[PDB]
Structures are given as structure tokens and as C-alpha cells.
Design a protein around this nucleic acid. Structure first.
Ligand SMILES: OC[C@H]1O[C@@](CO)(O[C@H]2O[C@H](CO)[C@@H](O)[C@H](O)[C@H]2O)[C@@H](O)[C@@H]1O
Lengths: 553, 415
DNA sequence: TACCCCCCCTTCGGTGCTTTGCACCGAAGGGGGGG
């Protein structure tokens, strides 16, 4: 006799009523296997047959369990889901093996038929109603309502999971010597107890769960390592991912590359050095999932380098609260970064990558900072603390960056590690005008309608240029005029523009850009020994600014 | 046996749904301890997923305090809660509080726990405690009493509050007392020792109700000594082309604030095409134009005053070398206050700590002066701020903020 | 022709200053993973 699981109150959204969707036509093989299942549910008390007073219905269908002889029953509740109250999901994140401490004794078991072991809300049951065709609709058929959490209902996971948690609560509290990781119905249990004492505690857990009606079938009960948990393999002193299958297929659809990049991301959490940039670039585009894609020379090299990493098996270790966390980052090029988190050398807790390109114009320092931030957050999720950082950037470089930059920025306690390629600032703008350097007053303009424009400059020595431009914009001409000044000037130059747009970009010291013209300017800036940029208001009759404004307007 | 003040939300608004952000080990440890104890005493109770609502929670240490303090970010609930100004429950703001020589800040929020909360409103106070490495799914609670950090709490409690302070106020009529959120601001013109004495009196006076984070702490302000940072034009004997270009840029911008400003004569000096470093003399006309501009910047801006119905806005600029400037306003180019901070905690090491301190200082000043917290425009990346700011936050309230990136083409508020 | 959680990469429309172009950012739909 089970202790009954108290029901969770559940409501439809205000002024909304239950679903009426009826049924779509079914193939006989499906309708057949279906009715045998409904009967078993009725018997075990998971479902009740009385239908006549119930106006509501929702479709049902079936599909085979993966590579199995068996047919699975699924209810499509999407319309009910809309009309049902919103829930707050209590699953905030995925546990990670690198967060587990080492345990002498370990067990992994699952709860059998989770959703169907939990009673549905009495008043909500009527809205779960569904209709099976008797035989191809010749005769009326069977009507049912769910007595427990149905598959397909948006509220089922949250409700089971929460009930699961309330049951476990007393058991954890009265056995502090145990550690239990509940992910949904899946349990990981570990202890430093002698295996006998541990085998005992597990069975107590098993009875405790049964008392509330939660079975733990022996088939899903893992006793001996390696334990298969959350997609990983847990050995006693080390963990790893379950084997990765790379398509070797010689003709790649859009969808092939998607799957490919997907698995590489998953691999990146342990296997160091994974790069998806060139592979992902094959994918950027309007192409439909079926369009076949030739692999670029670099993308093939990227895929090649990846395989070379995966050829070898890799293991992560477990977490030792006594020791500090260390995060070490390397630049992989093209805005790609990988890192390793570890406590002792050459034993990685885990690894990862940050390839994200945010913004049209950026540099390595901004990107390194972003990587630091992602790693800090990930670490707080898994270990609840911030790792000490080892970065390929010199202390002065960093000091020059963050002190001179106009946005607040910071990195937590870190030390320089000398591991080329190093992160550096590729040029630095003068704070004061340069004595004896030629002064370029630059300007550019474009016609809104024609998309034609000019860019040019006049200098204090009488030097002048104007260049015609086609299919352009005000903003582009403004950058263009600055480009000309840089091209036509010596190693030291003063440049005066009215363009807030242009100065905004350049003063942030970008080393890379989505714009070819900006990259060309960056290339010139790197060649210069000194550059002083200055802004003046337009249309005030300033300087050569009045003079160059007329030239290009 | 105390009846509950009924509370609604603004019509056309659901309750808060805001995801819990990751918490450090020490903060989760502190939260579990506090929430365990609060649960014993009925202040909070566990709930399920069937409550759609959530609010973020974390913990903080007030300045020079070694004990953790629970802080709920109610910013979303507070905006969605009925304005209690319409219910007349609003707290009026004394103009004389900023005039006092000393103002001490007491955290009285502990008192609010004594008052039950409307049953139908409790579902909106829902929060979720996370766990390290997601060992456990989130553990949800809701409030049975007036929560700290909720704008409704000081209002509903105001009745009781006025009563408790009545004797002290009447014994000491020259002392100003203002209530904002969980804090009590107590001003006086007395000598410090006398001031500190009367503050300790007010505390014991609070225990007399107590018998019938913690209250012992206090923080001293001196609003009489608060200063402003106006816009200033440099003084030079010789001016280069560059200097005059900057000055014209600065003046042309400033003309949005002070309309009577004129660059005509100075712009003329820029007539030719010249080397930036060339020294040029001012014309007779330009010297007066500069002088006449300087005076205009001495006098106050016209038709700028505080409107109680409008939100306050705060902008902050990083000036380098641990220097920070800010402006508080309601409508653009009409500034109610301008200021500058320097040598704060984290100066020349940590930008985010300094900015966090700046935000706290400005909010504190705004509360004292207008009884309002401004919405901040922060010079920083969203992700950068959101990563580190809870590490440095020492305040029981959280202001509104948004993120901006604004290159300083003119150095306007600092030279 | 179903349900809940997390991640990366891309695309696309809304939003506000760089302003009627350009930069930013969140949502959503592709993929990976978990139950
Ligand atoms: O940093 C802004 C960030 O915070 C969130 C989540 O906590 O919202 C909070 O901060 C906003 C800005 O002041 C408030 O408007 C909001 O009410 C509050 O919950 C996110 O919405 C936002 O991205």
C-alpha cells in the first residue's frame, strides 16, 4: 500500500476552455497496437474510460521506439498547452561531471515510468480527454481521460520533477553522508561509505521511493563502473564523454554540416582545441537544409585538425574543493579561443571554446575579456567560484587598455602566461597633437538619392586630394577620407574630421572588422609611428574643415 | 490577529517572471541558512512550479559588515505593484533632510517581517534558490510577510512606523526622519557625538517596540558638504589651433544647455588651414566672446527645477585615473545636479567596483535630495557589468539601469 | 504532426544613435546534449 502523492493544483488560463481537436486519420498498424496499450493503462489505473459527459478531445498517435520492435504512445497536447497555466521550471541547468567530487562508492538508478506514477489534478483530468478510432472509424471507438501526468503536456516535467524533489527531501536530510544528483527521474548517488553500507543505503532509498509508488527497475540500476550518466562515462578517478560519431560523408548537405558542428561543440567540453569557425562559415547563408555544400580548403583543414584531436581518447578529472581552480586561455586565430580549467597541471577538469564574434569592429583584448566572462560564469555554475586566470596577455598591455578605454572594464585575479600568439594592442592613438607632423583636414559626403560621393582632404602644407566615389554613403565617405589621409601621409600625422561615426570606431582600437575599408584603415594605422585624431563640429567654418567641406560637397 | 492590507498589481500587468542568476558558493550557503531559519518562523514557505512567478535573489555584505544579508531584486515586482501614492499610503519627502549637517542611515527592514502579507499577493513574491552544479532543481519559496526590498512594505508598515517614532520625534523636534524602502534616514544639526547619541536613542527606542543586516549598524552622511561639478572652460594665455578647436567643440555642445553661448568670433580664428600645434592669438572680439561665455556658464540654467511626477535619470562618464563624473536630470540638458567622484574603492585597480560605488553614492544622494532613485545609463558592457556587480553591491536597494557606449569626442565634464 | 532544461551558430526584425545608415541585441530556428 503506497503513500499517495499529493496532487498539484493546476488551472487553464483565465477565460479559456478545454481543447477540442478531434483526431486525424490513422494507419491500421497504428490503431491496432494503440488499443492494446489503452487497456493496460485502464487496468493499472493510469486512465479512466468514462467519456460521455466530456466535450473535450485531443489527438493521439504512435511511432516506434528507437530501433525497437515496440510502438510508443504519444498525445499531442499543444492546444491544451496553450490554454494551460504557465509554470515556473525548476530545472535551471545541467549538472556536469567536472563538478562532482570523487566518491568511493557510486550508484546510478532511474525511476520507472515516472509521469504515470504521479496523479494528475482531479479537476484538470477532464481536459486531457482523447479519442481512439475503434476500427478505422467504422464504429465509434474508445474515449479516455488521464489519471496521471500524460506525455506531451507542458506541465508534466515540472510537476513530476517537483514531486520527485519533495520525496527525496527527507531522505537527503536524514542521510547527510550521501550525495544525490537528481536530474528529472535520473539519479546519481555517491558516498565515501564502505560499499556494503552503501549497497544498504541505496536499497533504503529504493524502498523509500517505492513507498510513494516510485519504482526503480533493476534494468536501469547501475552497480559497476563505468557508470553511464548524463551522456558521460564515470570511472572512479576520471570521467569522459560517451563516444562521438563523426559523419565521414563525402557529400555534405546543409543539414550535414549543422549536425557536424553540433557534435564538435559537444566534444569541445573535454577535447581541447576544437575549431568550428570555418565549418560554421560554410553554413552561413540562405541555403535550404538539402543543398549540398563543397568544403572549403580551410574548412577541410579545420575538420582535419578536429579529427586529429578526436583520434586520441581524452579524460577529465573530478573536483577537489581543497585546491584552487585554474583557467588558462589560448588564442586560436580568427576570433577563436579555447581554454582549460584545471587544479593540478595536465589534469583538466574540463575544457571549452569561445568563438563568438559580437560587433562589426573589435579587437583581441575585448574578445579575451568576453572569454574571461563566459568562463567565470560557467565556473560559478559548476563550482560556485571564480578560477584564477592565466592569460596570453602582458600586464602592461592590459593596463594600457583598461585604463585608457572609455567603458569600465576589468578582469579578476590573473597572471601572464607566455604562450604565443600573445594578445596585444596593434596601435595607439596620441593624446596630444604632434608637433611638426602634417595636419590633414579630411571630409567626405554622399548624395542620398544618387549614392555617389567624394572623399578628400586639405593639409596645412597645401596638399590636397578629392576622389570620386560610387554606390556609397555619408558614413563610408567619411571613413574613406580618413583612409586617404593615412595613405598620403608620412609616419607621423594629425587628422581632423567632423565624423563622430568614424572616430567612434577607430578610437576603440579595433584590430579586426567585418568591413574591408575599416581593415584597410587598421592596416595603415599599424604602419604609422604616431597618429592624432581630432573631432570638430561641422558647418562652423572651422579650419580646413570649411575648406575641405566645400571640396567634397 | 493583524488584518492584511490588500494589494493589487497595475491592471494590464502580470507578476514578475525573472530567471535566477548563478550564485557563488558562499552566497548560496548564506541563503540556505537564512531561508531555513525564515521558514521555521513562518516568514516564508515552500511552493511548487504551479506558481508561474519568479524574482531573483542573492546576498550581500553592507560596508564593514562581516555577516551576510539577503537581498531580493524586486525591481520588476516594484514596477508592477500598484503605486501606493494613489492609495495615499505614500511617504512624503522632507526638503530639510539634505540641509542637515549629519544624516545616519539605519536598516529597519527587519521590522517588516512582523506584518503579514495579503494572501492573494503572496504568489508574486516567489523566488528560487539554485544549487552548485545543479545537484538539486531550484527550491522555490514565497513570502507570508512584508518582504525586505518591496516598495509596498514601507508603505503598509508606515502606520505602525509613525507611532513608534512619535515620542522620539516630539522629544527631539529638530531631527528629520525619512523612510525609504528598508532604510531610515535621520538628520540633525547637532555635534557628532550628540548626533550619534540620539541615533543610539532611536535604536533602543526601537527595541522597546522590539520587545513589545541588523539594526545596530549605521552610516553617516554630510549632505551640507555635498558639492557640484559645473562645466568649465580652460584658462590659457596662448592657445594652439587644437586648443581652440576643442574649446569650440565644447562650447558648441554646451550651447545646448546654455543657449546664449556664441562661437562666431572664436570659429573665425580657425578660418585658415593650419597646423594643430600652431600658436595663434585671440582677436579683440574673441577675448570678450570667451569672457562673455565664461560668465554665462557661471550663472544657473534657466527653467530647470525638480518635477515630482517625472523619473530621475543619471549618466556616468569614466574620466580615467579613478575619476568619475555624473549628471542627474529629468529632461535632457536641464540638469538638477552635476558631480565628480575620485579616489573611491577600487581606484586604479577595478573599474567595475568603482562604478558600483559611484552608482550607490548617486542613488544615496538622490534619495536624500528628491526621495527618488534614478535610472542609470552605465558606461559599460551589459555582460561585463552583469558578471561582477553583485560582488561589490553593499546596498539594500537596487536602482534601474541600462547600458551605453559613448566615445568622448569632446571632454565635456572634465578637462 | 507530443513535453520540459541547458549549450553554439545563424538569421532577422526591432531599437536608437553613428541617424534614414549603421550598429547593437534579443528572439527563434537550425544543430548538439540530457530526461
Ligand atoms: O542588467 C539588466 C538585466 O537585469 C534583468 C534581470 O535581472 O532585469 C532587471 O534589471 C532591469 C534593468 O534595471 C530591470 O528593468 C528589471 O526589472 C530587473 O528585473 C534583465 O531583464 C536585464 O537584462
Amino acid at each position: 500500500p503506497i503513500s499517495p502523492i499529493e496532487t498539484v493544483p493546476v488551472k487553464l488560463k483565465p477565460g479559456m476552455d478545454g481543447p477540442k481537436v478531434k483526431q486525424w486519420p490513422l494507419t491500421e498498424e497504428k490503431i491496432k497496437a494503440l488499443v492494446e496499450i489503452c487497456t493496460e493503462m485502464e487496468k493499472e489505473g493510469k486512465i479512466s474510460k468514462i467519456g460521455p459527459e466530456n466535450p473535450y478531445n485531443t489527438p493521439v498517435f504512435a511511432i516506434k521506439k528507437k530501433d525497437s520492435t515496440k510502438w510508443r504512445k504519444l498525445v499531442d497536447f499543444r492546444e491544451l498547452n496553450k490554454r494551460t497555466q504557465d509554470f515556473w521550471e525548476v530545472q535551471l541547468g545541467i549538472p556536469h561531471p567536472a563538478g562532482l567530487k570523487k566518491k568511493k562508492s557510486v550508484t546510478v538508478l532511474d525511476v520507472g515510468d515516472a509521469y504515470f506514477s504521479v496523479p494528475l489534478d482531479e479537476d484538470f483530468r477532464k481536459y486531457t480527454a482523447f479519442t481512439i478510432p475503434s476500427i478505422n472509424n467504422e464504429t465509434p471507438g474508445i474515449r479516455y481521460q488521464y489519471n496521471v501526468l500524460p506525455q506531451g503536456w507542458k506541465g508534466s516535467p515540472a510537476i513530476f520533477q517537483s514531486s520527485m524533489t519533495k520525496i527525496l527531501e527527507p531522505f537527503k536530510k536524514q542521510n547527510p553522508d550521501i550525495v544525490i544528483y537528481q536530474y528529472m527521474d535520473d539519479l546519481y548517488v555517491g558516498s565515501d561509505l564502505e560499499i556494503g553500507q552503501h549497497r544498504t543505503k541505496i536499497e533504503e532509498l529504493r524502498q523509500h521511493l517505492l513507498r510513494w509508488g516510485l519504482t526503480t527497475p533493476d534494468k536501469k540500476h547501475q552497480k559497476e563502473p563505468p557508470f553511464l550518466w548524463m551522456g558521460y562515462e564515470l570511472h572512479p578517478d576520471k570521467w569522459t564523454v560517451q563516444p562521438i560519431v563523426l559523419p565521414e560523408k563525402d557529400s555534405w548537405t546543409v543539414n550535414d554540416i549543422q549536425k557536424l558542428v553540433g557534435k564538435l561543440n559537444w566534444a569541445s567540453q573535454i577535447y581541447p582545441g576544437i575549431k568550428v569557425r570555418q565549418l560554421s562559415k560554410l553554413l552561413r547563408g540562405t541555403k535550404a537544409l538539402t543543398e549540398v555544400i563543397p568544403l572549403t580548403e580551410e574548412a577541410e583543414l579545420e575538420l582535419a585538425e578536429n579529427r586529429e584531436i578526436l583520434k586520441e581518447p581524452v579524460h577529465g578529472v573530478y573536483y577537489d574543493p581543497s585546491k584552487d581552480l585554474i583557467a588558462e586561455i589560448q588564442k586560436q586565430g580568427q576570433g577563436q579561443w579555447t581554454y582549460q580549467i584545471y587544479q593540478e597541471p595536465f589534469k583538466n577538469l574540463k575544457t571549452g571554446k569561445y568563438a563568438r564574434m559580437r560587433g562589426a569592429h573589435t579587437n583581441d583584448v575585448k574578445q579575451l575579456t568576453e572569454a574571461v566572462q563566459k568562463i567565470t560564469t560557467e565556473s560559478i555554475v559548476i563550482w560556485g567560484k571564480t578560477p584564477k586566470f592565466k592569460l596570453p596577455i602582458q600586464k602592461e598591455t592590459w593596463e594600457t587598455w583598461w585604463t585608457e578605454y572609455w567603458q569600465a572594464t576589468w578582469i579578476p585575479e590573473w597572471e601572464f602566461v607566455n604562450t604565443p600568439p600573445l594578445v596585444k594592442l596593434w596601435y595607439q592613438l596620441e593624446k596630444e597633437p604632434i608637433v611638426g607632423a602634417e595636419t590633414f583636414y579630411v571630409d567626405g559626403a554622399a548624395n542620398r538619392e544618387t549614392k555617389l560621393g567624394k572623399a578628400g582632404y586639405v593639409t596645412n602644407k597645401g596638399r590636397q586630394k578629392v576622389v570620386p566615389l560610387t554606390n556609397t554613403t555619408n558614413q563610408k565617405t567619411e571613413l574613406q577620407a580618413i583612409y586617404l589621409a593615412l595613405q598620403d601621409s608620412g609616419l607621423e600625422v594629425n587628422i581632423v574630421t567632423d565624423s563622430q561615426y568614424a572616430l567612434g570606431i577607430i578610437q576603440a582600437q579595433p584590430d579586426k572588422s567585418e568591413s574591408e575599408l575599416v581593415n584597410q584603415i587598421i592596416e595603415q594605422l599599424i604602419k604609422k609611428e604616431k597618429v592624432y585624431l581630432a573631432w570638430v563640429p561641422a558647418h562652423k567654418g572651422i579650419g580646413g574643415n570649411e575648406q575641405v567641406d566645400k571640396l567634397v560637397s | 490577529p493583524i488584518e492584511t492590507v490588500p494589494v493589487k498589481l497595475k491592471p494590464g500587468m502580470d507578476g514578475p517572471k525573472v530567471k535566477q542568476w548563478p550564485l557563488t558558493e558562499e552566497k548560496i550557503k548564506a541563503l540556505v541558512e537564512i531561508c531555513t531559519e525564515m521558514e521555521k518562523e513562518g516568514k516564508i514557505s515552500k511552493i511548487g512550479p504551479e506558481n508561474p512567478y519568479n524574482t531573483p535573489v542573492f546576498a550581500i555584505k553592507k560596508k564593514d559588515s562581516t555577516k551576510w544579508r539577503k537581498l531580493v531584486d524586486f525591481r520588476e515586482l516594484n514596477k508592477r505593484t500598484q503605486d501606493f501614492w494613489e492609495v495615499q499610503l505614500g511617504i512624503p519627502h522632507p526638503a530639510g533632510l539634505k540641509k542637515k549637517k549629519s544624516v545616519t542611515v539605519l536598516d529597519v527592514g527587519d521590522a517588516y517581517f512582523s506584518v503579514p502579507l495579503d494572501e492573494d499577493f503572496r504568489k508574486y513574491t516567489a523566488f528560487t534558490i539554485p544549487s552548485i552544479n545543479n545537484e538539486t532543481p531550484g527550491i522555490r519559496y514565497q513570502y507570508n510577510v512584508l518582504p525586505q526590498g518591496w516598495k509596498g512594505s514601507p508603505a503598509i508598515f508606515q502606520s505602525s512606523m509613525t507611532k513608534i517614532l512619535e515620542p522620539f520625534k516630539k522629544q527631539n523636534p529638530d531631527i528629520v526622519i525619512y523612510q525609504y524602502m528598508d532604510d531610515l534616514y535621520v538628520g540633525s544639526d547637532l555635534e557628532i557625538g550628540q548626533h550619534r547619541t540620539k541615533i543610539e536613542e532611536l535604536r533602543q527606542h526601537l527595541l522597546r517596540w522590539g520587545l513589545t543586516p541588523f539594526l545596530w549598524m549605521g552610516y553617516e552622511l554630510h549632505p551640507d558638504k555635498w558639492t557640484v561639478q559645473p562645466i568649465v572652460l580652460p584658462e590659457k594665455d596662448s592657445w594652439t589651433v587644437n586648443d581652440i578647436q576643442k574649446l569650440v567643440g565644447k562650447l558648441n555642445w554646451a550651447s545646448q544647455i546654455y543657449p546664449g553661448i556664441k562661437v562666431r568670433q572664436l570659429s573665425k580664428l580657425l578660418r585658415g588651414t593650419k597646423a594643430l600645434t600652431e600658436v595663434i592669438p585671440l582677436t579683440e572680439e574673441a577675448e570678450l566672446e570667451l569672457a562673455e561665455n565664461r560668465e554665462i556658464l557661471k550663472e544657473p540654467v534657466h527653467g530647470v527645477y525638480y518635477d515630482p511626477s517625472k523619473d530621475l535619470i543619471a549618466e556616468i562618464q569614466k574620466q580615467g585615473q579613478g575619476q568619475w563624473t555624473y549628471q542627474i536630470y529629468q529632461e535632457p540638458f536641464k540638469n538638477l545636479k552635476t558631480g565628480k567622484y575620485a579616489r573611491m574603492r577600487g581606484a586604479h585597480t577595478n573599474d567595475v567596483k568603482q562604478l558600483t560605488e559611484a552608482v550607490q553614492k548617486i542613488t544615496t544622494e538622490s534619495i536624500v535630495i528628491w526621495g527618488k532613485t534614478p535610472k542609470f545609463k552605465l558606461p559599460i558592457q551589459k555582460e561585463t557589468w552583469e558578471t561582477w556587480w553583485t560582488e561589490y553591491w553593499q546596498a539594500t536597494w537596487i536602482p534601474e539601469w541600462e547600458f551605453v557606449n559613448t566615445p568622448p569626442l569632446v571632454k565635456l565634464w572634465y578637462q
